[PDB]
Design a binder for this molecule. Sequence first.
Ligand SMILES: CC(=O)N[C@@H]1[C@@H](O)[C@@H](O)[C@@H](CO)O[C@@H]1O
Ligand SMILES: [Ca+2]
Length: 475
Amino acid sequence: SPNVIYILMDDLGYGDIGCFGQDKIETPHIDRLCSEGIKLTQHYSGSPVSAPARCVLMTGMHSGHAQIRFNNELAERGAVNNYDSVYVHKELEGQFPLQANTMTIGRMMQQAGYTTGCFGKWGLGYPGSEGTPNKQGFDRFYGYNCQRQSHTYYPPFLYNDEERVYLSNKVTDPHRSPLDKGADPNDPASYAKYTQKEYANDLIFDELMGFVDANKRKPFFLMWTTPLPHVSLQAPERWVQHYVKKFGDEKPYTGQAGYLPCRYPHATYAAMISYFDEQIGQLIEKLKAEHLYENTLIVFTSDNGPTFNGGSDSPWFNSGGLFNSAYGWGKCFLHEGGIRVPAIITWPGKIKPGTQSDHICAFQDVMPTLAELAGITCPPTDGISFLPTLLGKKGKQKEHTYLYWEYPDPRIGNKAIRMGKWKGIITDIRKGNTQMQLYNLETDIREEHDVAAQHPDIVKRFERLMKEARNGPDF
Ligand SMILES: CC(=O)N[C@@H]1[C@@H](O)[C@@H](O)[C@@H](CO)O[C@@H]1O
Ligand SMILES: [Ca+2]
């Protein structure tokens, strides 16, 4: 049973990496990883936003059964949105917690004899809660507890396990840091103040690499939950200038769609992904140098589709790849662009290199996949192992009858079914819509031609399957 490294990026689109059709952003180390293993083309998140996606991944329950189904900031605690206040009061930090003793893939691997580590972002329980990573199957955590904290890459503190470590960075509000009055938005010097001393991603990486170095002679399960490339747009000047040379001059971002101003939004978004790409390259080098490469399975994927704010330009990068990526088509929505994420798995000598599988699978499936892989009986799950697909034993690959998603956000409210080529969506539920849109993904991959009235049989079946699939209060 091998080492497992699960690399989860944050708001990385289906088409944001070279091996899924990206033409502008250079991802050589990720493309190399794809060439050395299997490419999954119909792999789905638990959810089109961060916390619930991660909840489905950690717990092997789909969004219709999961504890966390939306980003819940527990605003009743007080000034949770005030960055001065969160710095003073950790009680105000972070998100709705996982319940005590929740079986997670961390906990499951721990009981199998793995040393478990999570490096990057949590988002699944506030500090002091029973939902903290160390109380949810991780021997080791470093990085952001809080999805709001990661809105800046120069935060005043991070977490080493249960403890804050204070950095040399000053406290900032990345939503209330506009340019100085009368500062030229075309002058790069106007953006100098957004760069401080300690880039969180440098520190997260050094801690991940130290964990690998420390457990290099033991079975380890390591989750690299990088906040990249989630806004704000901040990257080392090295990588920004590389893409300023390639793309040329561009319109600056002044903060109109939230998060920090950025002189070069295109160059910086590309810089963020290629910088992380370079870190994966350094990790592969270390695994090879320590003779771990053959005995380590690596997953690379994203928690949801690409975003529409913070100076992102998903359409310009075609971050959806096959899918539309404008507001309504990506992040926050149950369109394919929102819930379908690029996936690579390598395990040198076991997974045939440069192969592809269109097998319909999702984040719930990771729990049973890892259970089969590590040779321990699978806990209760909505998932189905896709290990047979990874090892090219397609004969013994069980199939989901259908997949269900719900995103009960306060404003819009979404449900979706996929059953074969058929994709049903109900959106605007909070406005009292119950009318389903129906797309044939074989003939309409971009979901541009609603044909619900031409298949009332399929709509009725999907309405029934939506009732059967879900737990808890309806919306
Ligand atoms: C669309 C957008 O900006 N989404 C983010 C989301 O990704 C997460 O960071 C959240 C805090 O939990 O804050 C925002 O809602
Ligand atoms: Ca995300």
